[PDB]
């Protein structure tokens, strides 16, 4: 129970590596607001699986990537931290949500407006939320952005997300300085392929394909990405900040 | 209780962040080796912490960087095991021991008989540790490498120091690589100025210009990165292997 008494924010909490990590969180005794855009039944099924674990979690809804995102997520967070705590006080940031579909798109494929969509939801959100957050969070909080390893590993057909990614990392070592004297810690931690519940994981022919980019020759689990991330936002983390964390399963090796 | 049933050996235990590092493995059910070089006494006062808060330990002796090194080493840690728990299992490998100045050689005098011996301690024992320890190692094991953050900041009185640390962080490249189908993960961890006890530190004047190193403008203690160490031991980093892991409190932000 090190997060006894926390409340933290995943963005998109509702499937995949965010909700193992929504889960985790409240298992350490942190309160969960779990957000998501549009997937409500998969917001209620963390939530409910928060709540049968004796933990506590709400969820916010809020589309990111468009305009009042920001103000519409802050709404609900604090209302629902406010209900349930007297306060506002927002320990844990993690800036997991993203446009980050399987399918690739190939450079000669890739329009504007799927630049400004991942950049939108994957870099400019991420800031501006890292902004607003930090009003909110004491001396001694957590900001955690979920990169990917394209950023150290080419693949065509990824370019435009790796982009907005590498946007990220930036928020990550730019403001790792920035809130240092405030005891607030910023880093990145980087999945490889990870299996998020999506279709492509029940196909055992592609899976296996997917699983040679690692050391350890399987896909990820969310959880083994979530296990990570849960660790950075304890305590025991205090002393790493500016940080890339490579949780890929050895497939940044080169 | 994450180490319950499991062995560790962090070399140059008997002071410093090697100390806390097996302090800290103690505190989670690992039996410890706590090896050291000549300091019998401070050993004895490592094992003895251990014991009082619950924990089991005992010392090793062995000179590291001349003949006959990891064979003494692997006498005095297996007896220890042997007559412990019946096994000679090694779960945990920290590479922690390592030659240093209180304040580095200016490259121009720097001679032979010096790259010679910070190679012998820092970077070819660590590697003949490793070859030796994973005939014992299960699978699911940890090796951890102590490196520095030197190997990213350039500064010319170290050199000699840091090229052993850059030799020493290739073993984490290439080993994980190598031990990935055993289940063995292989990271190095980074620390900055941190506070090993020696007398510099008791000067308030020096302490606080070293600090100014850091992001958050403190030294680090032995346990901000004994904590991060404690954590790669663990299951919960199963997905990390091959990293480099910055517990410099933010030292490479400049
Ligand atoms: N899985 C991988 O292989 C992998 C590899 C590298 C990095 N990552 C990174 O890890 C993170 C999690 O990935 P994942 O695979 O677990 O994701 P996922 O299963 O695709 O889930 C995406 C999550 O983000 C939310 N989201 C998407 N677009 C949004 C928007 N415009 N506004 C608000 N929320 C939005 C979704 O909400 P709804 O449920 O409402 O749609 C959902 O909660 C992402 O940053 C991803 O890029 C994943
Ligand atoms: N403290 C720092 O600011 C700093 C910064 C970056 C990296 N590091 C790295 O962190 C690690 C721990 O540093 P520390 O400052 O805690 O070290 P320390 O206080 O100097 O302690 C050194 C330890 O290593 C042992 N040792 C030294 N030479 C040995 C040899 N030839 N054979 C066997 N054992 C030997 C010592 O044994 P005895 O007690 O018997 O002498 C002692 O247990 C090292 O890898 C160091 O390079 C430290
Ligand atoms: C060598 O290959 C990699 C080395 C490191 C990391 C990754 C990969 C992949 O091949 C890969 C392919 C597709 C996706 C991703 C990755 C990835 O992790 C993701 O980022 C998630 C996304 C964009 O949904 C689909
Ligand atoms: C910009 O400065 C740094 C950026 C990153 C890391 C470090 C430093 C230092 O200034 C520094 C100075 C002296 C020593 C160390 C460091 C260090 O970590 C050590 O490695 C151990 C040694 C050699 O015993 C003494």
Redesign the interface.
């Known amino acids: 129970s090190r997060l006894t008494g926390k409340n933290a924010l995943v963005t998109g909490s509702s499937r995949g590596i965010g909700r193992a990590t929504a889960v985790r969180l409240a298992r350490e005794g942190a309160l969960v607001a779990v957000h998501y855009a549009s997937n409500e039944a998969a917001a209620d099924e963390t939530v409910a699986q928060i709540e049968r674990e004796g933990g506590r979690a709400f969820p916010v809804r809020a589309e990111l990537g468009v305009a009042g995102d920001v103000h519409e997520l802050f709404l609900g967070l604090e209302q629902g931290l406010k209900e349930r705590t007297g306060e506002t006080t927002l320990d844990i940031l993690v800036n997991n949500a993203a446009v980050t579909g399987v399918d690739g798109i190939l450079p000669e494929d890739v329009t504007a407006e799927q630049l400004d969509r991942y950049y939108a939801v994957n870099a400019k959100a991420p800031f501006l939320l890292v902004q607003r957050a930090v009003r909110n969070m004491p001396d001694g909080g957590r900001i955690i952005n979920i990169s990917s390893g394209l950023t150290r590993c080419a693949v065509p057909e990824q370019v435009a997300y790796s982009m907005t990614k590498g946007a990220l990392e930036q928020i990550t070592?730019h403001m790792?300085?920035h809130l240092?004297?405030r005891?607030i810690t910023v880093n990145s931690v980087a999945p490889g392929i990870t299996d998020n519940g999506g279709a492509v994981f029940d196909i055992p022919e592609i899976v296996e394909q997917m699983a040679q980019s690692s050391?350890?020759?399987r896909v990820?689990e969310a959880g083994?990405?979530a296990?990570?991330v849960?660790?950075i936002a304890t305590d025991?983390?205090?002393?790493?900040?500016?940080?890339f964390?490579?949780?890929?399963?050895?497939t940044?090796?080169?």
């Open positions: 070592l790792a300085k240092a004297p005891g050391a350890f020759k990820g083994d990405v296990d990570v849960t660790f025991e983390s205090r002393w790493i900040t500016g940080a964390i490579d949780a890929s399963g050895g940044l090796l080169g």
